[PDB]
Subunit: 220 residues, 4 copies
């Protein structure tokens, strides 16, 4: 019966505009929803080479891939087969601001992802337009309900070249397609995201994420 | 520096496309204005996505700082950006987490400004004034203009008046970029705005918009 | 009914702590409430020389000194003789954060100001700790009521060396001592504050402010 | 060396919130290497407090955090001479607090000189109306910025009626002694609890458990 299979495929299509530069990126990947692990091969179809740091895009490339323990409601696995969508804001400390959307549907063993990404006001001398980012640091997303909608806030950080950090405040709203999907209580989701490999211009990127839901101390 | 080919009476042509809270929309604008008086009007028509499920007011500042009265002692970046034109990018951070970005690519052919506008909004709560259409108007605002990381930047602390005498705060940051080289950057200055929906139909599928803008140096000389 | 005189004396006592550094500063001044003008001689009694930019303190050194038109309700002049108090948050773009308070009273022809100022998290190499500020730019405070309390918001900026700018978001809450003082509608107050003179270490400072309330365009 | 498995905690807080002055004393014990501590708090001046006691609780020492061997422990290495911190708390409704603690150590006791100031809390907000229940368990993101160890938290207060009240916190940590090695980026999980209190929160028992870690997949 279950909509969620142990091994699932990921189909993704992103179109976006950062600082006036339009781009199209396709992703094709696989994942283990119950283990909270997924990997995806990304290919820039339009707008390559990207004039900005690829890292700002990577969290937009599905919380269904997160290990949820029995005592926390899994809103995301409960949202299928119909699916769910999310909206996100990324507020960077130097004034750069991004919003993103993803409409997530499923057919058989495959998730389909319609993603949009727009970023503005990144300074020319900043780490994003200078491509000085190395990776996102491991984060902890704070999950809670606000105005009937499941919300996730993260104090995120990009590691820069020269071992400095670049801060980003992330807010995501998650909405199931189907009515009656039970909202979860407050909890946390640990994230770890990594670009495993890329070509020189990041026209081709292999991406990996691991995520685990928990209740924080002392339950750990 | 050079003659802008900006005439005292200009036409305005505008297509906006956007998505707020998952809802796609296309809106056209046709207007007229007096750049040196800092005044403009425009009739807006929702072409796709009507009727909008959100407050039309959030879009109205996206619907050109050429239409601003600049005194002789403050550099006018925008009129000097023409004939070639300029583009802007904006972030709108509302107090309840709603966040919008917007851009506009502005060009000029003869007597007409052309505006390619894009508007994207996320995270507006369902029972907030935006999704509930509980806004009345923008209050008159004052944009702070300064050069930030080598780019002219406008920061506004704005307020939407709500039904029930309450206000709804929005912080906006706009970055302005001339297309042609050699455009002198201005020093710090202020721009007073007053934007107003003069009339609309019930669903805001048709809207008449008006703006009055005046640049000044603040106290004591203003 | 007012007892606010066209010419008023100003007595001020500030104590505070920025970056762990405690200080006491006294002010002696005069002003013209109905012209919206005031000046003040400031003297650092303890904590001198200040290791931070004096400019961050200057807005803490009374909206009584603002020219209000008849068509705008003057909360501040109406708050006397009993007086009023304000609290303020100053949020700087590099994470430095200040709070301040002033309890304002009137005895005869003199205003007494009990001021407190605390600032934290200023970067060692930012313009505040490095004293790279030149002046506050003239500003426009947005006045409006929030939760039954008069509130003013400012998109403020410090001019720096080289004519760069350092942004500060200022929120003040204004509370009359007497109950029932009628709240004003939305309006603006233009400000221009200046250090007219000072000694090398800013132990002695002559300060000036001009403020004028208005309705914004098209009226002003 | 400097820090014992069992330690005493002596604390004085003096502060002002919404114009209301207060003095709170604290006495407690903790196990630094287990990252646990308890404290009996007494409001000496300003009782009963007209605001939610919860907003003060994180002001009442990252010495009390379990640091694993693979992460530099700036705090335990800061002793015997000690360290200070400054903090901003930015609440979602405009309320803003700053706080400071100078932490010293003589013998088996920590000494804490705490100051706390809060402004712009709305009269019908959860803080002034005392509608908070607790802080939710949190994760502090630790990193260096401009030569100084810095911790950011997206924290939440649980309210009556099951809603939440968001607070963004930034703490700057500074060793008294020079040359203390800065750690690399890491995380600190927190759980803070009022164990017991009287009706007016004049007396409060407070508990914190905290554990440093490297995040997924190494935690
Ligand atoms: O083994 S995970 O780093 O791709
Ligand atoms: O296990 S402690 O949170 O009562
Ligand atoms: O700025 S002063 O000279 O009025
Ligand atoms: O002319 S006024 O109504 O904006």
């Amino acid at each position: 019966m279950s909509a969620i299979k142990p091994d699932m495929k990921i189909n993704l299509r992103m179109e976006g505009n950062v600082n006036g530069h339009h781009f199209v990126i396709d992703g094709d990947g696989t994942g283990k929803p119950f283990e909270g692990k997924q990997s995806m091969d990304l290919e820039v179809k339009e707008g390559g080479p990207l004039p900005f740091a690829f890292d700002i895009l990577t969290t937009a490339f599905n919380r269904v891939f997160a290990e949820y323990p029995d005592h926390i409601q899994d809103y995301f696995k409960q949202s299928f087969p119909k699916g769910y969508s999310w909206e996100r804001s990324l507020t960077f400390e130097d004034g750069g601001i991004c919003i993103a959307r993803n409409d997530i549907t499923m057919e058989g063993d495959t998730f389909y992802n319609k993603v949009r990404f727009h970023g503005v006001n990144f300074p020319a001398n900043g780490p994003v337009m200078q491509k000085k980012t190395l990776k996102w640091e491991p984060s902890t997303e704070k999950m809670y309900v606000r105005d009937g909608v499941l919300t996730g806030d993260i104090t995120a950080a990009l590691l820069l070249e020269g071992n400095a950090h670049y801060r980003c405040d992330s807010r995501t709203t998650y909405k199931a397609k189907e009515k009656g999907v039970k909202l979860p209580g407050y909890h946390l989701v640990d994230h770890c995201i990594e670009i495993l490999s890329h070509d020189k211009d990041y026209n081709k990127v292999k991406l990996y994420e691991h995520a685990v839901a928990h209740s924080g101390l002392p339950d750990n």
